Design a protein around this ligand. Structure first.
Ligand SMILES: CO[C@H]1[C@@H](O)[C@H](O)[C@H](OC[C@@]23C[C@@H]4[C@H](C)CC[C@H]4[C@@]4(C=O)C[C@@H]2C[C@@H](C(C)C)[C@@]34C(=O)O)O[C@@H]1C
Lengths: 144, 67, 260, 60, 185, 211
RNA sequence: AGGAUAGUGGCCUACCAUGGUUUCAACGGGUAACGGGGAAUAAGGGUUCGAUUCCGGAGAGGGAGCCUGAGAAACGGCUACCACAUCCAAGGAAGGCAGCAGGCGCGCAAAUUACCCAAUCCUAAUUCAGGGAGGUAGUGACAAUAAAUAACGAUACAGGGCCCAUUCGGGUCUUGUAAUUGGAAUGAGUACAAUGUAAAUACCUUAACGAGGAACAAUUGGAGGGCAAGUCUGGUGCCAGCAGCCGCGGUAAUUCCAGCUCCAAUAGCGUAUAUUAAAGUUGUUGCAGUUAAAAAGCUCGUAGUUGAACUUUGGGCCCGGUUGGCC
């Protein structure tokens, strides 16, 4: 039984059957269709620069209640108008519009984490200087 | 300290079958008048242009610089 | 690619040379000559690695150009001359006569020899034909065109060369029970006696060999090379005499030497 | 839901937090020596042994 | 270009990074031999995994295996030359019984304190690294060097050291000599 | 402090002979020289030293101030990055074109006059950002204000039609407004410490300062 | 059948005939495809990657043509067209960094317009010349190896020693100790000197100097659970923020901001993306299909896969490769 051809010369059916059923994956379908390269703000990248155009007060999801202080960053490499989270306390006073910031993934290969609706990125640097360092006041963001 | 040793039979032959850098090392020979590798590369390049002695153009350009 | 290569960079050289990975980027490419570059040992590696007679390439080169080294009676000032199997070397100083033969381990043994029997060489008949004006000729494996061979000769036989004149002294037919030297495969360098032969027509004949200590095996036919008859090889053999003993007694052979 | 969240509140708690200074404390043997003192503080001066060694036992 | 230079990491990591049963257990060893970290007690365990992997897939093979004694006796020879396994009990079951304190004890700075001159492993390896230890006639300066049981007759203060003789050290120079100006007016 | 102190090395030394260029190993003191590989952190002006004792040389008075204002924007949304990086590139060249934002968010570049602005803008069409830019007159921000003490007390209905809050709007003194912006009166300063210092500094009661 | 080729051949030309491949996937499309040796992971089976140290191919902006030559459809050879661009006296001319350095760009993303043929080799008329091939050094937390950040003296005695553990005023010959007190010990570094080295810079060595806070000062992350470590102090009050997931935050927050303490790995440690294991969540090994997603409405049926049994078995003798306690 077992509903699979166990015959000794059934290798062709086994491979064809397995090769069709591999499409029911999520990772394999993404890799084979190249949905990261085709339909994704990052062209299969990990980080991407951009310009802060405005600031968004992103009201969180339930059961939480908070303003998430995201920034509408448009990515230089493809122009996509994406929203980037701004970690750490303050750090929205540290950045303003028409800055340049380095974005990174948000930890979940898409699928925004936490209580943040529709924001799948977090800002790492700003003005070429780490936002982590700015939060600790080690460096100073140049006015450039 | 552990190294390598080589003894030659004669000073006259010592200058013969010895690598040239040991020659100036032991003071047997003097480091010849030579520029850096880049500059001595450039001079052969600019010498590659002129087809021979190049003196004929040298005296030629002077008369065309006259007027 | 647009023509024959001139650089044979390291990690592409035959492994039996035992070149050093860190000692350089390239390896000495054996120029054209009697031996294919796979089974050939260039002079530079011979005189710098197998002997340490020279520090490096320039010293090997310094030796050859004073015409101090000669191979097969000819000086051959080339640093990368394709010296291969059964190639005799003569040195005016040191009164030293070398010869290039495989040891049991498939690499060229540093087998020294004496002037009297160093004067001659051995070759294997690669093919027998007859050239212009119907003059018969055989070709030894080192490309020694030998005109007017004895009619008893055949292909794959082995002939001894005076090396003073390009003359055959004596020849050996491919007869069973005759010691053969293997020059190919896992049996490379194994001297042993023909057990029998099997044709297996269509190409790539099969040959059966029994080692001196009764270690049987089988190999191709194009990798064998007759050296004579059991007990009378026509050349001296290196230490170990092609016995291909096991992997255990070298523990014994090595510990007994220094560690007792 | 409401979408007009306020930007004028960012950094409030960090801004208004009661400022404190890092205490001046003796420099610590670090490395293998730190492992000795860590081995020691776990097997010589086990201050609180009540049931199980509380590695950070609250003051009480 | 360059022929590649072979290199391979010599340490592994636990699959579970944070286990109370494990962490403290090797901490006992790192607190019994003063390991500067636990990359040491991995690099031994990873080597111990690589060594005992061969036994793991060779105990599958019979006792007439050429390969078995081909490397088994020789590895024990290393173990008895170094000492991690004593001259007796020359069967590879004992190796599978070997615990890393073997290697941890056969570290130099472990042996040096056992033959004193240090009063502590705190001083043993600073004496090693402050240029005051000689394994033979040479200053081996690494605690986890795996002594081959031969420098126990050669280990001592470094002959170049003040403690091995011929030098007074910087501080004894800087104060004994400075007394002359400091003797008064 | 450790501010704006880049520790690098002169990538190459070039002596300016017209438009030509040529490397130089050593250039002695008191000479006109050109240096490369250091501007990418340099802010169009600075001092180079090899010991820590030195303070900075005085800033240049610019002779002429950057008087004219012009607000530049972009024809296409996707073309914002190309110049905004190159708009700093411009400020690196001329020692007086200041580049900043306005209050509504449009970039402002300040030339030294009607002639200077055009020259420093031909490049922004061909040199620094080939994609064309549009010249717009600057928008100046205004503040609204009241000084009438609204008679009808303000009052509103919460969208649930239940709650009610009454309001009245009064002017605030400019000095009070100034001292807010200057940092005298802050949210950081606590309600007790802020209330007293201004209760006498600018005429208000105790309560409103506390409130 | 000829022509062409170095030769074979629809390679081309003429004539002749209707052949060729295909559900065992032809053809067409995609490739974020140069192939392989290999790399990562790895119980086994495998999965993913393989531009990249070797072999092979292709290219020299894109096609195309060709001379020389043994070897080229070459490009650090040429000609033309297309794109770009350079100098200009405007008439013209001269180009190809996917060679080594470097520079305008693109981007998350990548080093010196350094030294030298000293070594490995290669070429040449060829010992000598050349070689950005290669090597040396600079930058380099790609990655990997080893291991500095520190010991000796006793700090209220807050430990079996002891006169049988007594009074812990006695060396309680060993462990813990209030930024208290002194003696050896050096490296990191600096530097004569040799040297390594083509030459040096370094290593290894060494003069001499170089520690008290040894300010020559270790960080990176965490302390609710997963998961090692706080219900400790202060602030905030569903705000700020944290939180990979659950969740914390509404005036007593073990989760926020801090400070202390404690963990963890440690000169490294996090984070992001991708991938392997975990994943027996791709399944041959090895899943599930009554209800959780899933048995085609049912039957026929070609390719496929699979396909009952039966055919010289057995018995003797001989030769000759073994362990054990009858060497
Ligand atoms: C150093 O650079 C400074 C100074 O030059 C000066 O403060 C100058 O003043 C210009 C204005 C400054 C005002 C304040 C900063 C707040 C509002 C700003 C203005 C907008 O309406 C008023 C004047 C003129 C404006 C115009 C320019 C749109 C300002 C501006 O910068 O936007 O601004 C620049 C940025």
């Amino acid at each position: 039984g077992k509903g699979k051809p166990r015959g000794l010369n059934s290798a062709r059916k086994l491979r064809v059957h397995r090769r069709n059923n591999r499409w029911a994956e999520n990772n394999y379908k993404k890799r084979l269709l190249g949905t990261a390269f085709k339909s994704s703000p990052f062209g299969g990248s990990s980080h991407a620069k951009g310009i802060v155009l405005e600031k968004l007060g992103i009201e969180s999801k339930q059961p939480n209640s908070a303003i998430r202080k995201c920034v509408r960053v448009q990515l230089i490499k493809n122009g996509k108008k994406v929203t980037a989270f701004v970690p750490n306390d303050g750090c929205l006073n540290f950045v303003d519009e028409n800055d340049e910031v380095l974005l990174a993934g948000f930890g979940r290969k898409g699928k925004a984490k936490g209580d943040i609706p529709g924001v799948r990125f977090k800002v790492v640097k700003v003005s070429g200087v780490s936002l982590l360092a700015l939060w600790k006041e080690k460096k100073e963001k140049p006015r450039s | 300290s552990v190294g390598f040793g080589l003894v030659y039979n004669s000073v006259a032959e010592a200058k013969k079958f010895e690598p040239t850098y040991r020659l100036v090392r032991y003071g047997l020979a003097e480091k010849v008048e030579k520029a850096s590798r880049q500059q001595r590369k450039q001079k052969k390049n600019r010498d590659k242009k002129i087809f021979g002695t190049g003196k004929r153009l040298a005296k030629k350009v002077a008369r065309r610089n006259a007027d | 690619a647009r023509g024959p290569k001139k650089h044979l960079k390291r990690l592409a050289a035959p492994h039996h040379w035992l070149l050093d990975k860190l000692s350089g980027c390239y390896a000495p490419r054996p120029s054209a000559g009697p031996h294919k570059l796979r089974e050939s040992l260039p002079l530079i590696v011979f005189l710098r690695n197998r002997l340490k007679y020279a520090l490096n390439g320039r010293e090997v080169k310094a030796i050859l150009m004073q015409r101090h080294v000669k191979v097969d009676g000819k000086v051959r000032t080339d640093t990368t001359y394709p010296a291969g199997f059964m190639d005799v070397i003569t040195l005016d100083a040191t009164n030293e006569n070398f010869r290039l033969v495989y040891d049991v381990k498939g690499r060229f043994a540093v087998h020294r020899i004496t002037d009297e029997e160093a004067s001659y060489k051995l070759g294997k008949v690669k093919k027998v034909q007859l050239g212009k004006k119907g003059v018969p000729y055989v070709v030894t494996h080192d490309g020694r065109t030998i005109r007017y061979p004895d009619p008893n000769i055949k292909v794959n036989d082995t002939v001894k060369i005076d090396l003073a004149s390009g003359k055959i002294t004596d020849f050996i037919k491919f007869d069973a029970g005759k010691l053969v030297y293997v020059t190919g495969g896992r049996n490379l360098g194994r001297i042993g006696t023909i057990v029998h032969k099997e044709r297996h027509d269509g190409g790539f004949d099969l040959v059966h060999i029994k080692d001196s200590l009764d270690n049987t095996f089988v190999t191709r036919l194009n990798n064998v090379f007759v050296i004579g008859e059991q007990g009378k090889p026509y050349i001296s053999l290196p230490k170990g005499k092609g016995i291909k003993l096991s992997i255990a007694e070298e523990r014994d052979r090595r510990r007994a030497q220094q560690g007792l | 839901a409401k979408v007009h969240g306020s930007l004028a509140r960012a950094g409030k708690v960090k801004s208004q937090t009661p400022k404190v200074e890092k205490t001046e404390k003796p420099k610590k043997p670090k490395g293998r020596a730190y492992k000795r003192l860590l081995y020691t503080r776990r097997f010589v001066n086990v201050t609180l042994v009540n049931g199980k060694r509380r590695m950070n036992p609250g003051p009480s | 270009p360059r022929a590649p230079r072979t290199y391979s990491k010599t340490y592994s990591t636990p699959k579970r990074p944070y286990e109370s049963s494990r962490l403290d257990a090797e901490l006992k060893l790192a607190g019994e031999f003063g390991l500067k970290n636990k990359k040491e007690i991995y690099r031994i365990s990873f080597q111990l995994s690589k060594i005992r992997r061969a036994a793991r897939d060779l105990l599958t093979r019979d006792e007439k295996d050429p390969k078995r004694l081909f490397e088994g006796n020789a590895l024990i020879r290393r173990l008895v030359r170094v000492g991690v396994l004593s001259e007796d009990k020359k069967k590879l079951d004992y190796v599978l019984a070997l615990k890393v304190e073997d290697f941890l004890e056969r570290r130099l700075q472990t042996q040096v304190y056992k033959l004193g001159l240090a009063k502590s492993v705190h001083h043993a390896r600073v004496l090693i690294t402050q240029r005051h230890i000689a394994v033979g006639k040479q200053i081996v300066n690494i605690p986890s060097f795996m002594v081959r049981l031969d420098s126990e007759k050669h280990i001592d203060f470094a002959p170049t050291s003040p403690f091995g003789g011929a030098r007074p050290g910087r501080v004894a120079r800087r104060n004994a000599a400075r007394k002359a100006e400091a003797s008064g007016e | 402090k450790k501010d704006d102190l880049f520790i690098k090395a002169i990538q190459r030394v070039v002596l300016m002979m017209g438009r030509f260029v040529e490397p130089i190993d050593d250039c002695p003191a008191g000479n006109i020289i050109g240096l490369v590989g250091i501007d990418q952190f340099l802010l169009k002006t600075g001092t180079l030293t090899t010991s820590e004792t030195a303070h900075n040389m005085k800033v240049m008075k610019f002779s002429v101030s950057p008087v004219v204002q012009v607000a530049v924007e972009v024809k296409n949304a996707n073309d914002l990055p190309k110049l905004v990086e190159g708009l700093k590139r411009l400020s690196k060249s001329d020692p007086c074109v200041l580049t900043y934002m306005s209050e509504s968010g449009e970039h402002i570049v300040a030339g030294t006059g009607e002639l200077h602005l055009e020259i420093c803008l031909q490049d922004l069409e061909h040199d620094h950002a080939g994609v064309p830019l549009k010249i717009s007159p600057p928008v100046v921000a205004y503040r609204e204000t009241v000084e009438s003490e609204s008679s009808q007390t303000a009052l509103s209905k919460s969208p649930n039609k239940h709650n009610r809050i009454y309001l009245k709007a009064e002017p605030i003194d400019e000095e009070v407004s100034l001292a807010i912006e200057n940092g005298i009166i802050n949210p950081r300063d606590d309600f007790k410490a802020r209330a007293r210092i201004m209760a006498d500094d600018y005429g208000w009661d105790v309560t409103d300062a506390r409130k």
